[PDB]
Structure 1
Amino acid sequence: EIDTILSTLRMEADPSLHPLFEQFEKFYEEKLWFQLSESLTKFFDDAKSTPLRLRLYDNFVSKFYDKINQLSVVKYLLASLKDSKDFDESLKYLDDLKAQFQELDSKKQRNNGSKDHGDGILLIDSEIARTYLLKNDLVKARDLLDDLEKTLDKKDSIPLRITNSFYSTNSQYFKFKNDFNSFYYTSLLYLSTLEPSTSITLAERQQLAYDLSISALLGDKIYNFGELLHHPIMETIVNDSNYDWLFQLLNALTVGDFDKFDSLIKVQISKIPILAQHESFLRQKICLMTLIETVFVKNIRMLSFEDISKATHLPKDNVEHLVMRAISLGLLKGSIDQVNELVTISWVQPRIISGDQITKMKDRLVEWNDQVEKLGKKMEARGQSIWV
């Protein structure tokens, strides 16, 4: 039946891959399809470098689609059509697997009396947009993602895997335009909503980690450089040559050093020429990280111009400019007084909160608690004799 195909793939494959094809024959036969579902997922992860993935999926998807997990038919498809260099093929097998499930729920739901197979339609749908993205038909993919989004909102429970793929797609769309900000904000949600199941490599996160870092530095609205590091994705990956100089670029911005920043940047302007054309935006971003940070940690909520001039290492002229741009962004808001040489703030936009800032916030409230307590002791002394 399908045993003959399995045998032919096995002669053709590498000796290391020969055990996997045998496992599939024995599990189908014993009719134990939990084992069979897991064993296939392991194949498509590790032997999609070998191009014997293309004829293997075909057998399982098209003859089982109610006898294997609702997640897993979509899993074997996504791997096979990822390394594919034809977009016509990528599109094709999606229209096919989409047909099976729409057909299936006309009968199945009735006999069975339960189970919805419409969850899997939405991943297929993320993947149709995905095909469009690589083919450079970005416009088409956008519409299909907005139609996906609608379905999500009217679901009572939305499992994490379904919205994970949606965000992956959305992430890809933004980096084609090169909208750093729009990519950064979409990617955090992708990272948070990432599945407890493993079938993602170390290598994939690595590629992503380069992409997160760059967006986070060459942005203009981004004052969280350890929101990267509260995910494993950039945190645990710092031990290569490329992700040393890169980790250091992030960290220099975090504590607001200009001296350390100068040393890195000088070198990496030559190396990375994406970084050189965007050098201007980055160079001032440092001063803006010092502006928001210094008024926050201090108890006074008005800052002099001379304070900013020494810290950021700039003329007094250049300082005003910086202040006006912070009001414009929404980094800070308030009034700019040139004559009295103040910037007196009325808003602090919410920031990354590290252990040191909590310590500050906690301290300041101890003083506040003592202030209330002392006033309270006075309020008890006057009027002790009569209250009512």
Structure 2
Amino acid sequence: MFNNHEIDTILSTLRMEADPSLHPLFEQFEKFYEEKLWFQLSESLTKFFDDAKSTPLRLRLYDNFVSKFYDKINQLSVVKYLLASLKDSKDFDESLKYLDDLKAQFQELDSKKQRNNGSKDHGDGILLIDSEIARTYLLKNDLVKARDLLDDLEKTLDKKDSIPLRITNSFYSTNSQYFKFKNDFNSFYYTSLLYLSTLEPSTSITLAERQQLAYDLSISALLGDKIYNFGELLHHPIMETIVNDSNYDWLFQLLNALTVGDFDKFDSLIKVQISKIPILAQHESFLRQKICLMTLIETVFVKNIRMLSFEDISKATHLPKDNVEHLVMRAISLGLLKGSIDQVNELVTISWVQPRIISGDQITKMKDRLVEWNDQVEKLGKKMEAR
């Protein structure tokens, strides 16, 4: 189809007259790489919709068009696209070769004009090298090499104003990858949440990126937790128009599984092997206590008091008498509790202090509690008033 030659050439002409800038072997060459329903460029503003969507062997030609692009448009666009396009295009060997080309200079010093970070804006000359050396180096090589790359990535985050945000993006994606690379689905769940949180409200997104993040969140959320296993994912976008692909049924399957507490349901939650991890082997006890704790916390007394029967914690969790003894024993260690449960008197007498789930039955519960708090105050006031 003509649309890559058509859009690139007309816009290329529009934003500068002609002077070594039209490029007929560029116009044909890009033409050759992508004339399908995906295009390899769409010039200037168009570079925010079409830029490399297949392996971009046009690369050496584009280096001479980076050497035109500034006066065809702006600041941001140059630093925004051409580092990410190789990375999404799965051009790992090529990404490194372009990082040798660019290294740290593209118009610094008495060219002036404030510098941001790449993959959104025109960056820090140094910050491109630093961020992407970590992104590439992690994928390639070991965890000990990774801890070392993260410490440098940490130095560069610290060393700046927070203003362009692009650098912070670099930090979360980089850091999330180490927790993927090991086993650390709980640490990864926290990092992926942060990555999505500073990704979505400013756009700049790519279908490849949102595919990793939603699927990666779904595996990490089964694989580890600390707060509660699905209430937070109903105030926590798992598929609210981030992307719906890769069988997000699993999130809803998890809540049904958490309640029943069937083993059959755990295999039929995702698929056999990926349900187990090996993550879930430690996980099921932690996950297990989470469902029990929340369900009781709302229900037992409208006020919220730190009195629980040991028996009704067993009955609700659906576990034998020794087992619950061990599980609770771990649970006090984890905190969000304290005040001192008496393991004789059979009094689970630990203090009320934890967060309460969702805006739903939080609100029902709040009304009941409000009428009571108010009524109590009003009596004291009345009596005083009168005398």
Question: For the superposition of Structure 1 and Structure 2, which TM-score range results when normalised by the shorter chain?
Answer: 0.7 to 0.9
**Counterparts in 2 of 1:71 and 1:229: CA distance versus 1, 3 Å:** farther
Determine if contact 1:132/1:138 at 8 Å carries over to the other structure: no
Task: Measure how far apart 1:135 and its partner are.
Answer: 1.4
Task: Measure how far apart 1:131 and its partner are.
Answer: 1.0
Determine if contact 1:238/1:247 at 8 Å carries over to the other structure: no
Determine if contact 1:326/1:333 at 8 Å carries over to the other structure: no
Q: Is 1:349 equivalent to 2:386 in the alignment?
A: no
The alignment partner of 1:34 has SS state of coil
Task: Measure how far apart 1:82 and its partner are.
Answer: 0.8
Calculate percent identity across the aligned residue pairs: 100
**Counterparts in 2 of 1:359 and 1:284: CA distance versus 1, 3 Å:** closer
TM-score by length of 1: 0.72
Task: Measure how far apart 1:86 and its partner are.
Answer: 6.3
TM-score by length of 2: 0.72
The number of residue pairs the alignment matches comes to 382
Determine if contact 2:215/2:246 at 8 Å carries over to the other structure: no
**Counterparts in 2 of 1:29 and 1:127: CA distance versus 1, 3 Å:** closer
**Gapped runs of 5+ residues in structure 1?**
383-388
**Segment of structure 1 superposing worse, 244-253 or 298-307:** 244-253
Whole-angstrom distance in 2 between the partners of 1:45 and 1:60? 15
Q: Is 1:6 equivalent to 2:11 in the alignment?
A: yes
**Counterparts in 2 of 1:304 and 1:141: CA distance versus 1, 3 Å:** same
Whole-angstrom distance in 2 between the partners of 1:189 and 1:57? 34
Determine if contact 2:12/2:21 at 8 Å carries over to the other structure: no
Task: Measure how far apart 1:72 and its partner are.
Answer: 2.2
The alignment partner of 2:383 has SS state of helix
What RMSD over aligned residues (CA atoms) do the two structures have, in Å?
7.2
**Counterparts in 2 of 1:34 and 1:288: CA distance versus 1, 3 Å:** same
Per-residue CA distance 1:200-255 (angstroms, 9 max, x = gap):
24454233222212222221423253443445443347966722134321465489
**Counterparts in 2 of 1:2 and 1:54: CA distance versus 1, 3 Å:** farther
Task: Measure how far apart 1:377 and its partner are.
Answer: 0.8
Task: Measure how far apart 1:101 and its partner are.
Answer: 3.9
Per-residue CA distance 1:275-330 (angstroms, 9 max, x = gap):
57855654555445546565686532211101112111122333322222211111
Which has a greater percent of helix?
Answer: 1
Per-residue CA distance 1:42-98 (angstroms, 9 max, x = gap):
477564225455345322334555764333223332234315666554233224324
Determine if contact 2:117/2:164 at 8 Å carries over to the other structure: no
**Counterparts in 2 of 1:335 and 1:255: CA distance versus 1, 3 Å:** farther
Q: What is the aligned counterpart of 2:307 among 298, 302, 306?
A: 302
Whole-angstrom distance in 1 between the partners of 2:25 and 2:75? 22
Whole-angstrom distance in 2 between the partners of 1:214 and 1:111? 33
Determine if contact 1:335/1:344 at 8 Å carries over to the other structure: yes
Determine if contact 1:126/1:145 at 8 Å carries over to the other structure: no
The alignment partner of 1:370 has SS state of helix
The alignment partner of 1:348 has SS state of coil
Task: Measure how far apart 1:181 and its partner are.
Answer: 1.8
**Counterparts in 2 of 1:297 and 1:82: CA distance versus 1, 3 Å:** farther
Determine if contact 1:13/1:52 at 8 Å carries over to the other structure: no
**Counterparts in 2 of 1:305 and 1:125: CA distance versus 1, 3 Å:** same
**Counterparts in 2 of 1:351 and 1:146: CA distance versus 1, 3 Å:** farther
Q: Which residue matches 1:238?
A: 243
**Counterparts in 2 of 1:367 and 1:138: CA distance versus 1, 3 Å:** same
Whole-angstrom distance in 1 between the partners of 2:125 and 2:364? 47
Whole-angstrom distance in 1 between the partners of 2:21 and 2:235? 37
**Segment of structure 1 superposing worse, 119-128 or 63-72:** 63-72
The alignment partner of 1:66 has SS state of helix
Whole-angstrom distance in 1 between the partners of 2:330 and 2:191? 25
Whole-angstrom distance in 1 between the partners of 2:295 and 2:64? 60
**Counterparts in 2 of 1:240 and 1:185: CA distance versus 1, 3 Å:** closer
The alignment partner of 1:337 has SS state of strand
Whole-angstrom distance in 2 between the partners of 1:294 and 1:234? 29
**Segment of structure 1 superposing worse, 266-275 or 337-346:** 266-275
Q: Which residue matches 1:267?
A: 272
The alignment partner of 1:14 has SS state of coil
Alignment of 1:159-308 (within 5 A): 159-196=164-201, 198-202=203-207, 204-223=209-228, 225-236=230-241, 242-250=247-255, 252-253=257-258, 264=269, 282-283=287-288, 285-290=290-295, 299-308=304-313
**Segment of structure 1 superposing worse, 89-98 or 214-223:** 89-98
Q: Is 1:103 equivalent to 2:108 in the alignment?
A: yes
**Segment of structure 1 superposing worse, 260-269 or 95-104:** 260-269
**Counterparts in 2 of 1:250 and 1:297: CA distance versus 1, 3 Å:** farther
Task: Measure how far apart 1:120 and its partner are.
Answer: 6.0
